[model samples]
Target: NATEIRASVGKMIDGIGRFYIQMCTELKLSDYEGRLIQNSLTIERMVLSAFDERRNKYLEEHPSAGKDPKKTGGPIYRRVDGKWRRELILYDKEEIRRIWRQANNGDDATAGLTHMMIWHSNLNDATYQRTRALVRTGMDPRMCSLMQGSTLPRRSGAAGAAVKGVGTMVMELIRMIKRGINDRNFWRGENGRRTRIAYERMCNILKGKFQTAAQRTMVDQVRESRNPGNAEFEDLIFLARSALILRGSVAHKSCLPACVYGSAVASGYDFEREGYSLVGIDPFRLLQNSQVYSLIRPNENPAHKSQLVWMACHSAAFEDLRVSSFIRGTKVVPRGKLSTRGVQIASNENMETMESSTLELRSRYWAIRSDMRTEIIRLMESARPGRGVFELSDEKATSPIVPSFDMSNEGSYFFGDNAEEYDN
Candidate 1:
């Protein structure tokens, strides 16, 4: 029975291997030997990484579980349906590899392997290997697939699209998945537990159902199109084309089309403009959110949605500054923080008006600060004029002015060479 389970596990691994191989082939990554090896290696490495992470988690929580779980029973590992099992799920690499190898080989013991325990254990291994890797990364491994450079391609029929189109599809899928996670709905409460199961179920169904069709068609049309700037062009045809899809409709400007905000720039646009009525989070929240945001259906108002997405990004920039400020404490105002504000306010003043309001504000702030500094200097000068005790005057002041050297009209224009400008 043990051998049978191992054989079945091996088969499972083989199936995955086939899938990886197929993808490599489609992507023109025909160098299957190395990539396949790398795939398996990565999977194995991920398993190792998970084991390390889990071990660390256990050690911290149990304190003595590693040395002696008998004393503690290691805080009762629970499963679905309120079931609890021992803490140690997989022990040593040998058992896992044995099952894995056998599954790859597809041996006869794997026959009549209908036993739920065997299936469960085999599937459990697969699920853990997959999910554990995800949890460790804090996102799906697919999120990194583009960078991974070993994504499997679609089947032969799926190859109807252009290579560039397929590439676009890949990018958009990653974005959508990213956005879905980013959505507040994904984790409004602790791990989304506070959300309804029904809602979660619906989300799952919608996500799988929509992306599958959208990406497939998107890739196909991209291949068919010849124009570089056409809707089917590279890097997110579905999303771009969606803009065209709703071009003149009442929903034209809305982000309801999944294609619009799925890309980074597009999403940024949506956020800046508040694209959707159901925009779950504020722009800042959208940016700071580590979760993925997916839209099962596109938002209406493509322009606004695009702006909203940008707004989120812009908000994030501010959010980052705010967070850094808080962390650094003591209110570290970035140098020239008011520079942009000053320029913007000043530039808009009425040229035809008698006095420039913005320029006046600037003059006042500068003069006030300067006067305060001069007063401090005055105190120091009076106290330390040891060699010559000079008399100081409490003058009937005219206006705030800079310190100067030259004696001018009624002590109005002080010493600075540019002092003449003050009178006018």
Candidate 2:
């Protein structure tokens, strides 16, 4: 039975490999793009397992289960009705590999595999290894045909627009998955490092923090020029950017989205202005979410749903975090204390404007920070003599004396040489 399960898992992996090749060819994407898309989807599938109702039921019943039971392989079993049952939650390749690898590592009877187990284990091993090799070399693995496709005619106009919106949303979800997996496996492999690097670059762009002021100014000007909207293009970019943030938040496995949204709307503006509706997005319509054994049907509501799927995962993960902390408190002696000292406000003014708002924001902040640094450096260089300078020494010259200077606008150099611009 274990062997059969392994074979099934191997088959799925092979199928995914084949689908990867076919999509790459059909979509005409570069190798890196295809890999990013593939890895992103794979990660999303894995992360979504967190939202499974079975896991919630299991965790709820075992109040003291502590942190992620998935991490420990302890929450795999849940009592259904009056009987205890175990589920083979697919997509946790690491755990699956670990279990089978340990079983076949030695001759201990307790860890020994059955005939079928060995057969399936070997098959899984070979398939995964080959799949990995292909991934490494940017080569397509041979066809193992796993994913099915539909032949429906492509819809045009608004309905077509909706389909495209949903497709990009899915891509966004996939990207988030890839980011999470890469971060989780940063120290594990070459592919992990590559994914992590790409993720960081995209995040930096989206978050709007840059390295220099000129670069920021350049980007800001470019973004400002696109203020005239083509409704279709603008809407597309907006949805995509929202998804981008959703991905980063999920990948980082934090509740920062709540903080970001909360802060974004604390200025008395309507939530809709910031792109959040009171009702939130529908996961069913967007992703066809449903029970494990049931078919997925789309929700046909009038309003567009946004960010609901990621929000669900975020909410679930945060609850797990809380539960783990509570369990920890009950088990360990309390010795630490902490408190917040201050509050800071953050704004997304730049984020709400321009098609390349992410780039614009990054450049703006970078310019501000760079200008501040330049002024500070200039102050350091222009300090000397009887100016606002002082030195202190312990004993005579045998010890050491450190001098410090302060230039509080006492001279013409206060404005510095480059501060000559004036507007009439």
Candidate 3:
């Protein structure tokens, strides 16, 4: 039964593998680049299961019991009723990302798969050996730096307009699934579209459901918390696609689609964004979201849903940063902790306008912060807007928003140079 449940766990990994493939293909990444995507899932899975040493010894003693009570026990047992009942909640921990980055070649290093229970226990001289050796050097910091923005937990390196398209594309896939568009009909039309006729249909489609979906959800308002940039999502999306390609099946039926357009999109998006909507122990309580059954419609087991959501979230925020770097055309490989590298806020050149506004004059940047909760309280009172910090009238403009140059001074050099500009 551990085998069965483990296999169930494997499904989302299988699915994400597929997504990684296609995202590489779509982004025109080299075959070698695929290795970065490959290793990321490796570490993430290990990270997922590394949390598997259940605290509830009852399940550990009776392996089949708590591990996956649903499949073995009839639904009468009340599947994982609440928090702590399930495996460790997939919350953001420093260690997880540290190990993740180390594997993806982030500076912080560690020892082998010997730690993760899944590694040495099974796979006789199997995956972990070479995986360990390779992971030390992991994804070659160059590539890892670029892609891991989505894969790792940090601001993106250099993912500009290109990844914006990637973000929008992911939205389209989810929206299609959200609106109940069957894959067959959708893909068929993709290959089966006429230019002008399709254009007319396109205008109607965009103006129709897309509008309502936007209006209904806080797509924009829901601040893009840690929503991984498209590259990371693309990695998972392509991985999911590969899963379908590898194993074509309409297993059972409430519904079924994944890898690429199959399952990732099928589940609802915005776990990272909308927090006030639902609160739980799992900050991103994506571990065992019930929506998977409704959204993807697995023919067999609800094996991959929680992992899928968790994996996507794990894959997300960093990718979110990655694409941000791309959008800004920053360095792909990281120099420091990206989260510390607060974004700059400057308006466009107003040369075209006969007269300029305050926004167009001296630009100010928000030193992106950690712990926004306490941050706001202190800032609103001390650094309140009423304060002369932002007043344009002062000759020596008092824009108090200075960057935090700490250990992971991500944009250290640039900020050093730019601070003068802001000062002037």
**CA deviation > 4 Å runs, candidate 3:** 1-38, 41-193, 209-424
State each model's C-alpha RMSD to the native.
32.1, 28.8, 25.9
Candidate no. 3 TM-score = 0.17
lDDT string, candidate 1, 313-332, tens digits: 22111122333222222122
Comparing 1 and 3 on lDDT, the stronger one: 1
**RMSD (CA, angstroms), candidate 1:** 32.1
Summing lDDT over every window of 10 consecutive residues in candidate 3, give the lowest-scoring window: 354-363
Compose the digit string of candidate 3's lDDT tens values, residues 1-424. Answer: 2344333323322333333344334334333222322222223333333333333211112335444311111110011222111111232334443443443334221111211211111111111112122123222212221221121111111121112222122233333332323344442444334322432332232222222232112222222222223333333233222221122111110111122111232244421122211111121222222221211121311222222222222222222233322222233222122121111112331212211011100112211112322332343345311111222223233454232222342421111121111110
Residue 260 of model 2: what lDDT?
Answer: 22
Scored by lDDT, model 3 comes in at: 0.24
On the 0 to 100 scale, the lDDT of residue 12 in model 3 is 29
In candidate 2, what are the lDDT values of residues 1-424, reduced to their tens digit? Answer: 3455433333322222332344234334333323231122322233222332233311112335444535322112222453323233343434433433332232121111111222122212111212233233222222111000001012111221221222222233233444443465542477546644544333334224222343234223323321212332333233233232222122111111111222222323232222211111211111122111100113311110111122221222111222222221221111111111001001211212211001000000000003433443344455443111111211123432222222332221111111111110
- Clash count, one per candidate: 59, 6, 38
What is the TM-score of each predicted model, taking all chains together? Answer: 0.17, 0.17, 0.17
Q: Which candidate tops lDDT?
A: 1
